[PDB]
Amino acid sequence: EESRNTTVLDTTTTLQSSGFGRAFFGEAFNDLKTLMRRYQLYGQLLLSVTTDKDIDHCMFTFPCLPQGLALDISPHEIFNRCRDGIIPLIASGYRFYRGDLRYKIVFPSNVNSNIWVQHRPDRRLEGWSAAKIVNCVYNHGYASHIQITRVNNVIELEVPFYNATCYNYLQAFNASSAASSYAVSLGEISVGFQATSDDIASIVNKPVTIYYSIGDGMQFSQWVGYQPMMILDQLPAPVV
């Protein structure tokens, strides 16, 4: 058995527990779920106008999942340098999950146009490749929200759990079973603008950042051990 204990040979006196930092810092940390709701960068993109897009056109689509994206490293100096952050490092330790996610997408300053955001629980996830942000229409019956840039250029979201499942896969997904692609993402969030073709040209190569966190609904399943890890200071310095 793993967690058995054959013969304790303790030398120690009993330590005063700090109560996981509650005694010093005035706050507990034993519950890792209350750390999980600290926001983490999900994926940062650069806007790129390909066609003279209609107002209906989504500017980018991305699947929505707590696993962390297919990591997209001119590299992005965070994903080149600060690997993975927190939440997929915890999410490596659990085979399944079930629960909500929060997003809080942040938009740049020079944009002014109105923003529509969709949840699409119809969309499956086909393989771990193309499970990243994709620069590409608006739809009716999908769950929708418009944030106005002029009031405040940061939308916030509580994207719920819409799966016909008991829980969903949390490790990186190879798409073995064909219906199992229905059971990885919560759905698919799409961000699109109402900007016309003349004004969206100014917004090219502006960053759009998306954050994420779980938001109290998430409850992880059966334990799985960690994968092999990379130690970050061993990464090379940029020789100049």
């Binding site: 030398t11 120690t12 006196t13 009993t14 330590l15 005063q16 700090s18």
Partner: protein, 249 residues
């Protein structure tokens, strides 16, 4: 009042400060200046090893610095910047022997981590005809400031609480110094997170205020002795004595 009848034994009562087997006396009443209240044991938060008191051996008094003080020393002049958990060892390794010969300090040789409150007496033996006044001041973490080179003066250390030694009445300065540092333990040897500043609590510094003023036929010398008791110490982290490097000269 007003009936001094001195016999063969002099007049005054010789007051004791009995401890373990080192017993020392002064003829005059002390002038203590306690800086901070008494601290807790602190063994519950960061030591699971055998945290052993040594009040039978470590609470003995020990002379760590005697020095000559004459009238040639000017007004605002240092005499001794004793760093007290170091100077208990530095007087030993200055005085031609290792730590294992002095029974006060062998738990520093064995154990690696120290805590504890100090007692510090600065006795003078001035003649009554001399006029002068030393001061003793405890400061916390002198070497952890760079600006003490602007402060190392009698006017700075007068503002904090400080003991005074008048050479007129040959007053003695008892000085309770409770342990107060940022981390609740002082290590005793080279330690994996700091090396420099080993076992440093701060400065006991003895600054002159009133220099010796005497006649032409005056007693020039005035020796000053400093003793230290170490009572509420705790020692933890037992390790081999061959790891203990010598303290810095």
């Amino acid at each position: 009042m007003d009936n001094p009848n001195p016999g063969p034994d002099g007049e005054g009562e010789v007051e004791l400060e009995k401890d373990s087997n080192v017993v020392l006396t002064t003829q005059r009443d002390p002038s203590t200046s306690i800086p901070a209240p008494v601290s807790v044991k602190w063994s519950r938060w960061t030591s699971n090893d055998v945290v052993d008191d040594y009040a039978t051996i470590t609470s003995r008094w020990y002379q760590i610095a005697e020095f000559v003080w004459s009238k040639d020393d000017p007004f605002d002049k240092e005499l001794a910047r004793l760093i007290l958990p170091r100077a208990l060892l530095s007087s030993i390794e200055a005085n031609s022997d290792a730590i294992c010969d002095v029974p006060n300090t062998i738990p520093f040789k064995v154990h690696a981590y120290w805590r504890g409150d100090m007692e510090v007496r600065v006795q003078i033996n001035s003649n009554k005809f001399q006029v002068g006044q030393l001061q003793a001041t405890w400061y916390y973490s002198d070497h952890e400031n760079l600006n003490i080179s602007s402060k190392r003066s009698v006017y700075g250390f007068s503002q904090m609480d400080h003991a005074l030694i008048s050479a007129s009445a040959s007053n003695e300065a008892k000085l309770v110094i409770p342990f107060k540092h940022v981390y609740p333990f002082l290590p005793t040897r080279i330690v994996p997170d700091w090396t420099t500043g080993i076992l440093d609590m701060g400065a006991l510094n003895i600054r002159v205020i009133a220099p010796l003023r005497m006649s032409a036929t005056g007693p020039t010398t005035c020796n000053v002795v400093v003793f230290i008791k170490l009572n509420n110490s705790e020692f933890t982290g037992t390790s081999s004595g061959k790891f203990y490097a010598s303290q810095i000269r």
